Amino acid sequence: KEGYLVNKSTGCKYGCLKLGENEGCDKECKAKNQGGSYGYCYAFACWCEGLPESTPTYPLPNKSCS
């Protein structure tokens, strides 16, 4: 699936200045704990692709950052 990376501890999204092709969001997205396949900065936050069901995406059911 696609979505914003969420910090399992804060329930907050991962911020990112440089928009579009973002090497920083793509790394964090591919992380083994993430399992994603492709990430870029969108709306000033890290967006992801190819995430397995098991991995959570913003928001968090019991953890708010809003």
Question: Can you give me a brief rundown of this structure?
Answer:
The protein has 66 residues and is an alpha+beta fold. Helices cover 12% and strands 15% of the residues.
Radius of gyration: 11 Å
Tell me the CATH superfamily: Knottin, scorpion toxin-like
Element string (H = helix, E = strand): EHEE
Oligomer: monomer
Structural class: alpha+beta
Percent helix: 10-25%
Rough outline: globular
Distance between the termini: 22 Å
What is the CATH C-level name?
Alpha Beta
CATH names the topology as: Defensin A-like
Give the percentage of residues in beta strands.
Answer: 15-25%
How would a textbook summarize the main sheet?
Answer: 3 strands, antiparallel
In the CATH hierarchy, what is the architecture at level 2?
Answer: 2-Layer Sandwich
**Strand order, largest beta sheet:** 1-3-2
Strand segment tally: 3
Structure annotation, total helices:
1
Domain LCN-type CS-alpha/beta: 1-66
Keywords: Disulfide bond, Ion channel impairing toxin, Neurotoxin, Secreted, Signal, Toxin, Voltage-gated sodium channel impairing toxin
Protein name: Toxin CsEv2
GO biological process, one term: defense response
Can you give keywords for this protein?
66 residues, alpha+beta, Defensin A-like, three-stranded antiparallel beta sheet, globular
Explain this structure to me?
This protein is of the alpha+beta class and 66 residues long. It has one domain: Knottin, scorpion toxin-like (Defensin A-like), CATH 3.30.30.10. It is 12% helix and 15% strand. It has one helix at residues 23-30; strands at 3-4, 38-41, 46-49. Strands 1-3-2 form a 3-stranded antiparallel sheet, with helices on one face. A hairpin with a 4-residue loop joins β2 (38-41) and β3 (46-49). The longest helix has 8 residues, at 23-30. The chain is globular, with a radius of gyration of 11 Å. One of its GO terms (molecular function) is toxin activity. Keywords: Disulfide bond, Ion channel impairing toxin, Neurotoxin, Secreted, Signal, Toxin, Voltage-gated sodium channel impairing toxin. One of its GO terms (biological process) is defense response. Belongs to the long (4 C-C) scorpion toxin superfamily. Sodium channel inhibitor family. Beta subfamily. This is Toxin CsEv2. It is classed as toxin.
